[PDB]
Design a protein around this ligand. Structure first.
Ligand SMILES: OC[C@H]1O[C@@H](Oc2cc(/C=C/c3ccc(O)cc3)c3c(c2)O[C@H](c2ccc(O)cc2)[C@H]3c2cc(O)cc(O)c2)[C@H](O)[C@@H](O)[C@@H]1O
Ligand SMILES: OC[C@H]1O[C@@H](Oc2cc(/C=C/c3ccc(O)cc3)c3c(c2)O[C@H](c2ccc(O)cc2)[C@H]3c2cc(O)cc(O)c2)[C@H](O)[C@@H](O)[C@@H]1O
Length: 40
């Protein structure tokens, strides 16, 4: 069982923007979408 202790480390203090944290990794590769109409 993992338990994370939080003591010092603020990600937002005085800045008007929704801050992006250091974990950004989504699965992307194939995106299917064939148009059947003009050029087949
Ligand atoms: O000398 C401190 C100067 O601070 C500035 O404001 C600030 C004071 C403090 C934070 C104050 C803090 C205080 C007590 C405490 O226990 C913990 C944190 C921090 C500021 C600004 O921006 C940092 C910030 C904000 C958003 C982020 O996404 C990332 C960083 C923040 C920051 C956070 C942090 O984890 C570590 C830092 O060294 C700084 C003021 O504008 C100045 O006037 C002042 O002189
Ligand atoms: O090389 C860039 C080419 O861009 C194309 O337009 C685009 C390529 C891509 C994105 C490409 C992408 C690629 C790799 C990758 O790992 C991730 C994302 C996207 C486009 C256009 O608009 C989407 C958009 C833009 C602003 C927003 O606020 C919201 C959406 C964006 C979009 C983002 C997304 O998270 C998921 C999507 O399906 C689409 C043009 O049609 C091409 O001509 C051009 O060659």
């Amino acid at each position: 069982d993992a338990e994370f202790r939080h003591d010092s480390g603020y990600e937002v203090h005085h800045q008007k923007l929704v801050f992006f944290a250091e974990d950004v990794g989504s699965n992307k590769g194939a995106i299917i979408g064939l148009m059947v109409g003009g050029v087949v």
